[PDB]
Amino acid sequence: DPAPATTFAHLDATTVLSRAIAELGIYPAVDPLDSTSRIMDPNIVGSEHYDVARGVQKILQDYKSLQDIIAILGMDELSEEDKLTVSRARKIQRFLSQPFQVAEVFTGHLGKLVPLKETIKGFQQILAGEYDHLPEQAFYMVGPIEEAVAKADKLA
Amino acid sequence: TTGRIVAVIGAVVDVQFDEGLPPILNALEVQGRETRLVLEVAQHLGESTVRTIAMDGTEGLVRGQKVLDSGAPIRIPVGPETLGRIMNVIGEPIDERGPIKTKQFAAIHAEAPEFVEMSVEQEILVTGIKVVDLLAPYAKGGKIGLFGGAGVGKTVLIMELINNVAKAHGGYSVFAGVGERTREGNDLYHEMIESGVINLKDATSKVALVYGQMNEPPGARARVALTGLTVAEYFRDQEGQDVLLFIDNIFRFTQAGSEVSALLGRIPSAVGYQPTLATDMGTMQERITTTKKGSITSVQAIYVPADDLTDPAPATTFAHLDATTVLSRAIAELGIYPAVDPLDSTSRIMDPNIVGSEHYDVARGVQKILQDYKSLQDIIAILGMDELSEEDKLTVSRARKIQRFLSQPFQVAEVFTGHLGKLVPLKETIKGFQQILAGEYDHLPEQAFYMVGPIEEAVAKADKLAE
Amino acid sequence: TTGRIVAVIGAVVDVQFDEGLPPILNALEVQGRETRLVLEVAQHLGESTVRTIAMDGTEGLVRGQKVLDSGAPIRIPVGPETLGRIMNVIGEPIDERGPIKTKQFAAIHAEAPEFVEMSVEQEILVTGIKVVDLLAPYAKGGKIGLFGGAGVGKTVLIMELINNVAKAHGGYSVFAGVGERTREGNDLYHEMIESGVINLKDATSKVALVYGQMNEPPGARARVALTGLTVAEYFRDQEGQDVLLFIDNIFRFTQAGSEVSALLGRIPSAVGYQPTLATDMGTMQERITTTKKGSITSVQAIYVPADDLTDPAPATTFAHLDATTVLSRAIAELGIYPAVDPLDSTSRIMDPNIVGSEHYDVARGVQKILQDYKSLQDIIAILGMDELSEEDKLTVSRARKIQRFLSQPFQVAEVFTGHLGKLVPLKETIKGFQQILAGEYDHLPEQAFYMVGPIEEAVAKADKLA
Amino acid sequence: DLEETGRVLSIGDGIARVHGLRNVQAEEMVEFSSGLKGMSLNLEPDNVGVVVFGNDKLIKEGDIVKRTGAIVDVPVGEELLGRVVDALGNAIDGKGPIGSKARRRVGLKAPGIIPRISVREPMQTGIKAVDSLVPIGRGQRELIIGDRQTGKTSIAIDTIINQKRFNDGTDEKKKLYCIYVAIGQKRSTVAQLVKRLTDADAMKYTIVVSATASDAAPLQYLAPYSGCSMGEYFRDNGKHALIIYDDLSKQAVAYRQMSLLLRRPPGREAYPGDVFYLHSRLLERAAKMNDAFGGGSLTALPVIETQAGDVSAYIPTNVISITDGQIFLETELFYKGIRPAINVGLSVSRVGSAAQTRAMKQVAGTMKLELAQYREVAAFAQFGSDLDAATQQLLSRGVRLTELLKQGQYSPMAIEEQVAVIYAGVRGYLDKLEPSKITKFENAFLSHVISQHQALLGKIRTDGKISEESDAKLKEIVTNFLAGFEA
Amino acid sequence: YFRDNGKHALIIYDDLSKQAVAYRQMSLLLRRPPGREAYPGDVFYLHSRLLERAAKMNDAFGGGSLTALPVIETQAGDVSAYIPTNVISITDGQIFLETELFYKGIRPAINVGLSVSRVGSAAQTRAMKQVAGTMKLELAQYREVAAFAQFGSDLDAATQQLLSRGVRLT
Amino acid sequence: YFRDNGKHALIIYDDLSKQAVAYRQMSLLLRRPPGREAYPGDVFYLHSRLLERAAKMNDAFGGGSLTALPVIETQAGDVSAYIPT
Amino acid sequence: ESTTSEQSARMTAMDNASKNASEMIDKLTLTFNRTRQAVITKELIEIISGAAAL
């Protein structure tokens, strides 16, 4: 639409929220692949932050491209390498959800604020395969990675 | 009669006349200008005012400036002295070689040949291009159209045709550059001086050049195709001759018309076009034709806006053609060049009684195997190659070889392919495809068929690939 | 009073009046012409000029030619004499049988019945066709969307409705052909004569026909549904009957309206339709209802542009529909007449609070078993009709007897077939099906239930096969 | 005199605005000082909007325009046969004037509801797919519709060619006069066309009306009405005509040009609100007259070009609802080898059986059912190893019947030839013949029966149907031939 | 000024999408009736007369040049739209960038089959021609065959080799 | 009236889709520029100014309230369409 | 034991793919008609705006 399309050029950072993502219960409903920032530069954020960010987006884009086949044939027809990116991608998606103080009535969870370092570490660890054993649902609606691990143990 | 400019809005100039009103299509000359500024009369508005379209820029025009009626439409030099020369829309030389000293001039507007003047004669014009010759061959004296979106290969194709057919043609050629790149006009002019088709020294020039490119205002682009066609009409009629007419790109005559339509007071038709799109095209196209007096083989590049063949402009052009080559971006994207759609190119002479049952049966067989593959593609892309019978996958391997064997390196495309250009005789084209259809090369790899001339080059390539 | 034509632009004529202006919707009569040219006032442009839409070709018209304000909207013959006759949009007869001899005329434009004149009660309109009455019952004064189209027995079903309504309710019928193909109008006339519902001999015709043929200007095709409606209004208001109105077809009413709107220079709305799409439809449809005096019930054939049910034209129509009757080619090829899809056709009044609590549960029970029969149809062409449980074999045997029991011999098709016509009472239809479900006929053979009326003929036919 | 004459106020784009002519009627043909004709489409308070029949370089502001007593009419009668004429009936083939005795107005009402009888007499095209599966009757309007280059004109030409077998015979009832209306086509295309009709000796019973791409918009608009009037000469004199409008797409474009330039309001795709009306009034003029009215007919075969298969576009929508049926052509069928490229699942004729002879009716009924049942399964073809024998049978009968519907161009078949061919497939004789051999088989089988069994064919025709005797005779011709074919 | 004085200039128009929008505003306010997509009828000509001025001059005119890199913004990856194809139909090639490529880690995110140069090897040094001469077509065929191969089912040595070469060149 | 006098009312607009269609009819007859789905630019304001009037008043203004239940008809579950959104 | 398990699984998986394709068909048809309606409307609004601006 002319209004939003014209607005993009006026921003240094854009957070694009998606109804599709909302309807999956991911909150906040940010499209990881449509939101950008003029300071996502290794010279500004440092190379570890930059590299983890780019790695997350790659796995998410990789997963997105496998989703045509998933919709018709399902998980079973995938190779073992593709099943892995799918399961890591789905973990990353959920780890990007977060309980907001402002939304406690809707989530039924206490609000969380996550320090940037703990954000980098969490996703870095998921990407590195350190949590392939934990189930998806453990990464949903938590603060730091520690909470998803505690949540994993609680799910017995 | 002397008139005065009363309104200027872009390319559209209104002129009031005190005495006699110049008829529609008359050329007016603006006074007080450094270079000739012609206005063509388009409408009588009433109150002794005419509406005109300008043939050059209207910057510097002042209300009250004087305009003279020339008495006639734009009249251009025709005859042998146009050969080797470059003209603009109004017939001035733009090659910096002085006057075009012909005996005769001709109006760029004229009636189309009558029904009784029509010829039905049609024989194949072999080009050396495998896909064209095989599936939708051109006819001598026929109307050929090359359709495609922006950057898919129209001009490269038309340069290959010029190379393969015009360079050793008996009679005369006309090339009209209409709303295309000036760079391309310079490329072509020097290529033809280098090849001797144009000769700056003697009188053996075989091509006349008319240019009104995309740096020109719309009035110029809307009339320049008529200028070129007029040069070709003279050769067809007043020398009864065999003529080659090349136009790149005829869409730009329609587009230029659409640029000024609103300023001419027209309500727009669908997709933003002038309501007169089809009649405008008719009265122009119907002059581009063979008659009993002479033959014209016309080849017209036809731009397709937004890659949509249903666009009013291309859609209305189809019925003016005897053979069509449709280029596709989806095909170019794959590296298949020329990017011709084998299932959307057609020819009036693709008949077993004209090309023979062997050419025809092969052509139709190639198209069948490509349609069958096309209809399998998306299914096996999901259910897998394994679910196919050992005959469904045979036509898959064969169709993919045939898709590759329709590609071909053009002489004129060496700067892009890195391959030496190939010209392939009709018999060899037919035989090559006959053979793949018959199973003769099921043992060769797909890639061996990519970007070669004759079928022997694919066997050669297969050995080279082995390691 | 007398006006002069000041503009002719196709089907649009501007007329200037020296004195008092003809109000919007008035019929104007053009003078100096072979056949009657009527103009309907659409706007007052100011300066004593009106803009009008023509009901016929305007070729030959001259500026200054005289026009006569008739003082009213279009007025047409109404009453028992319209029956078995064919008139056009301005009420002229076109069957060539001379004039139409009625005491009353009526204006084709009329506002809908007021709120206080509204029945608050929802009654079934018994057709006597088993499929309809049991599963998707017509509502008295409701609108019914007839789907399927050409090939599946729409014309036979139409003629049967005229028959069964003039029979079991003493109600007459009107047929309004909006954009009627001339060839099909002739064909229809003669089919109706041959089936009896029209009679050129006496005065026992059951249907008036009103044709606004495809080759007429858009004003004419836009107005015919109203002409047809006016005719029908007479029999409800003046004679107290439960009337039947057929509109074939409603999309062509929308289309003509869209055309007239275009010609009047109004800006098109979404998808090219008239801005007045919903009110054009509303001011026509609302006239079809149950009043205190009687009721009009309308059967309307719907064309769905692009098979797109969200298209403005079908979507605007559906807001007015109380039922659909879906004629299906699949059913026809299985020999079940009438070829009504018993699961695809629906009724809004199929509600225990409106029809029986017993009517509702029989219909729901019929539905569930026919839906359940469909599930088992994959397990048949795989395992054979024996691997089923005793519960599952029972529902197949009962469902198939129900399918066949939904068929019916029509009186209107006695000539082509040979079988005698059946008009089944509502309580007998409900009873029949209730008992096949109960198992009170499991001992009987399957083809005992085919092409019979009431369940009493299923017994009589099962004995005659022994 | 500003009642019988006017003066030009403004001129451009084929529209002249004329002060005066106070007495012109709506749609009257006027005349400009130069000699050009024009037609008065817009009568406005202060001007007449005149549509120009020619090049407007010949008309200036101030030009005198006159009413003349003119009527828009055309020459009519059998002196038009074998002639090629423009939209107003002038000869353009160069063979001298038309020897016409009668004339007829181009704008006239269709016969009303009463003077007609049901459509019952076959209009044979000679095309197996059409004659069997989409049968056309005398007085029907049947649309030929599809994208460019799908074979629309070819259906029409084959149809015209087929009529020779009746027009050469002695039975006057079966005869059919042909009208081809070329609208917005290029001249050389029309030349190729009449050439083809000449070499086929079909021109002698064909009128060609031609309003080509460089003819003015008003001429292309009129041309189909003119040609219709010529056909009505036949319809109203106990005779039968066939008219092809090739195509109505281009006529509508020419109308839109005029509407837009007269500044009438634009609707969908910029078409005026009376464009439906333009075609409905044309196509209702096709009719079957009753005996009281002479028993004559005018069958119409309008042609519409779609754009990328969009049959729900504005003008296709219009002509589809106006006609009694449609023949749908498809690009994809065309390249698969289904030529003619008729979508037999979608194509429909509402007349149907009523327009088929008993013999065709018999076998066509079986073919229809077997092809429908084939279509249900046709995607298990290249994905079917372990299908039940019953459905391998549907697949096999289906691919074979499909091959029988394939037909070369320029060779229309007599009905009894068509039933012999269809019989062979619907009786199962070709079920073990490999599908690619079928068209070789058919070509050969038909030459044979046309050669040695003119009497079997003479009788399949005469008995109206296929007798028990014809059945036995066909059984032995087919079994023995087939055995010979596969030797 | 550089072009006509024996010098070489490079111009970047960043971007011409926003220029066309500005032209459209001005044109509509001047009350010139809108054309396709609300832009004026002559939006092609807006850019065509601009970009034609990028040119290489002959020695008699001083041997200078002006090279242009106009920028167009697409919506939802649609290079096939009206304004995009307008501009493609003016220039001597285009570099088409895609977000899908970008996120997958192909940066610069150039789509090979859809990008083209209309000058080709004539604008390369011989050394670059010697190594790059056939690569573009090769990489187009690589992407097609990679897709057709997608499910690793018995592939010959020739396609296996093209795949191996393709992934490494990428 | 109720909201402003310490009373509680409930209003149902059945339905606001049909109202918007009414308004588009009026706007197009006024030759206002059609936008998305041929709706005028002010179709949002039509509903916004109406539904803002449903409010809960504090004790200082009587404690009354108006509760609104507008009805919107979607076409085939499409909640993303212009009027629904 | 194996083919019983294979042909059960394939039956099931092919059941699911068929139902998944069927849902996607429904969803794409809806998208088709929404796009279809908007193209008509957009094309018309262009014609109107041009006509009006004169």
Ligand SMILES: Nc1ncnc2c1ncn2[C@@H]1O[C@H](COP(=O)(O)OP(=O)(O)O)[C@@H](O)[C@H]1O
């Ligand atoms: N036959 C061909 N072989 C190789 N590359 C080609 C061929 N045709 C076109 N191309 C590529 O596409 C570019 C655009 O082709 P061109 O003919 O200029 O497009 P247009 O169709 O717009 O005239 C060429 O400069 C070249 O890079």
Ligand SMILES: Nc1ncnc2c1ncn2[C@@H]1O[C@H](COP(=O)(O)OP(=O)(O)O)[C@@H](O)[C@H]1O
């Ligand atoms: N039955 C047929 N068999 C083979 N080719 C055909 C057949 N019918 C038509 N064609 C060919 O198909 C092409 C398109 O046919 P044409 O009648 O001109 O289609 P249209 O009028 O739809 O453009 C022509 O070259 C024609 O010779």
Ligand code: BEF
């Ligand atoms: F860009 Be191409 F010359 F149409």
Ligand SMILES: [Mg+2]
């Ligand atoms: Mg080019």
Ligand SMILES: [Mg+2]
């Ligand atoms: Mg044709």
